[PDB]
């Protein structure tokens, strides 16, 4: 008797659901008066303060593998390039056929890395075919046919190519991501979370910390670090797994350079437009290369292998170089300055272990390409213009995207892989999730109104 309903508004409970999240970035590039492909497209202001707030006595489920807000991220990263490239002039007229030779570099009779390439092109808007010349990297060039030979670009037959507008910069910037009105974001302050299952310490925030859309395979660089020990995350259904993410607690320096000096040459296709071509080479010629501290890396491989063994307790672990296939997997990929570096990582992942510090620097040969299958997309490619002079680079390696082969007798063969671009960000957005508020609630109580 005398138990009687009451209703509350503003209630603190929640349920899981998908949402449309906000972009959130700096105002103008690195707060510098230049155009940036990410920041400049609105994305609201340089929100300085994350509203972190910690929860007493909250245990929370989390599924970073199935979390909805990686999909919207991938959709957003795709769309920004797609809309930004559109006004830039295309490469379609140049796709016509080529007749070219070995290039004579300065003070040199040969250069084994360079074709010098001659091509027909429309010089006025829509007439006056004429001959013109430039030079290209091999791996945008192919050839078979004719009574005498005949040359062609790698991708223009299968897919359309567009060169990025030259003033736009590729460099990544920290982007924050905020929930819209009526939803919130949870974190797992826990420093050893596996990625799935309940989370024993949870805090909430309107916006995530800055996340950097670094394009990379084979290595997580310019990223975050685990606060506790190294964390190894994998699919939980079976021993064999789709991908494994290792995330270091200490980050190792990588520097890279492209020493050859490059001067530019420009070809007018169009009206208020210009195809940007690569011209004469200058300077003592070397291939691009990167440098890593040796002894620190030896400790790094000992540490990650020390924890792989906890799962996998028998004697052997074997790391191996890339498996094979097309180049896009078998070299470590990134971009720096204004061009996209591809490096043969095989010398760096040749170790083997059994169970039971600014010297001796290792160097890796690293190759460079100008036409790209970006976002691993069907039927489309991008072209990158050359940058004047040499380039120097520094970045901080943070982790690996590795894969396991089909098992064999008392011997495991781990090599780089995973490959899917979504795993790049799934390695960093594992902490977060998005959730809806239901502010309404009902209860019994010892209370009424007056009928008068």
């Amino acid at each position: 008797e005398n138990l009687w309903v009451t209703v509350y508004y503003g209630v603190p409970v929640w349920k899981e659901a998908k949402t449309t999240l906000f972009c959130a970035s700096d105002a103008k590039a690195y707060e510098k008066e230049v155009h940036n492909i990410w920041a400049t497209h609105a994305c609201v202001p340089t929100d300085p303060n994350p509203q972190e707030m910690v929860l007493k006595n909250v245990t929370e489920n989390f599924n970073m593998w199935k979390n909805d807000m990686v999909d919207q991220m991938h959709e957003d990263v795709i769309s920004l390039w797609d809309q930004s490239l559109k006004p830039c002039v295309k490469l379609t007229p140049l796709c016509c056929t080529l007749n070219c030779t070995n290039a004579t570099a300065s003070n040199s009779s040969i250069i084994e890395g360079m074709k010098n390439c001659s091509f027909n092109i429309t010089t006025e808007l829509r007439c006056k075919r004429e001959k013109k010349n430039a030079l290209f990297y091999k791996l945008d060039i192919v050839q078979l046919d004719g009574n005498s030979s005949q040359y062609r670009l790698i991708n223009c037959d299968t897919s359309v190519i567009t060169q990025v507008c030259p003033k736009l910069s590729f460099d990544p910037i920290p982007i924050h991501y905020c929930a819209p009105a009526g939803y919130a974001i949870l974190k797992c302050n826990n420093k050893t979370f596996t990625g799935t299952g309940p989370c024993n310490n949870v805090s909430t925030v309107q916006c995530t910390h800055g996340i950097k859309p670094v394009l990379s395979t084979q290595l997580l660089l310019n990223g975050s670090l685990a606060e506790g020990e190294i964390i190894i995350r994998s699919e939980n259904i079976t021993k064999n797994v789709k991908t494994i993410i290792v995330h270091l607690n200490e980050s190792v320096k990588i520097e890279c350079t492209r020493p050859n000096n490059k001067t530019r040459t420009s070809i007018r296709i169009g009206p208020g437009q210009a195809f940007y071509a690569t011209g004469q080479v200058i300077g003592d010629i070397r291939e691009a290369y990167c440098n890593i501290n040796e002894s620190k890396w030896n400790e790094t491989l000992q540490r990650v292998s020390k924890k792989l063994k906890e799962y996998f307790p028998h004697k052997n672990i074997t790391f191996q170089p890339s498996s094979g296939g097309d180049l896009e997997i078998t070299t470590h990929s990134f971009n720096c300055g204004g061009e996209f570096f591809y490096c043969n990582t095989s010398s760096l992942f040749n170790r083997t272990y059994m169970a039971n510090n600014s010297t001796r620097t290792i160097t890796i040969h690293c190759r460079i390409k100008q036409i790209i299958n970006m976002w691993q997309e069907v039927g489309r490619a991008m072209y990158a213009p050359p940058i004047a002079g040499n380039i120097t680079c520094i970045s901080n390696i943070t982790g690996l995207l590795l894969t396991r082969d089909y098992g064999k007798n008392n011997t495991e063969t781990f090599r780089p892989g995973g490959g899917n671009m979504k795993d790049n960000w799934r390695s960093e957005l594992y902490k977060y999730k998005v959730v809806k508020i239901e502010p309404l609630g009902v209860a019994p109580t010892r209370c009424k109104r007056r009928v008068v």
Partner: nanobody, 127 residues
């Protein structure tokens, strides 16, 4: 070791379709392009096309583009092919293939030579 294993032999009706599968082992299936090749009795091998499981881009011989279709699945370690509108000339032994690994010195598409094959499958067009 490396092996590619195929479906059973087929005898199918004229005018209908024939569909074949090719399951692999010994290597990560998602990191190698896959070919399809046919040989009639006593004749040359004829190119059909290629597929790259990593992306699903496709390229066909224009002789067969209206007749053939490929697809691949990373969770199955298997590639599929489908040839529509069978005729008596299609009676042949069909193969799937794998290419060699790219190396640093290679130009593009130096490696699409046939590195490994399967045991093949017999297809006969008959009522």
């Amino acid at each position: 070791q490396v092996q590619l294993v195929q479906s059973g032999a087929e005898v199918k009706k004229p005018g209908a379709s024939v569909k074949v599968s090719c399951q692999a082992s010994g290597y990560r299936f998602s990191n190698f392009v896959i070919h399809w090749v046919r040989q009639a009795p006593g004749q040359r091998f004829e190119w059909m096309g290629w597929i790259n499981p990593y992306n699903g881009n496709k390229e066909f011989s224009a002789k067969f583009q209206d007749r053939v279709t490929f697809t691949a699945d990373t969770s199955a370690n298997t590639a599929y092919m489908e040839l529509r509108s069978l005729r008596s000339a299609d009676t042949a032994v069909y193969y799937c293939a794998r290419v060699g690994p790219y190396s640093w010195d290679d130009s593009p598409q130096d490696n699409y030579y046939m590195d490994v094959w399967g045991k093949g499958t017999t297809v006969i067009v008959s009522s």
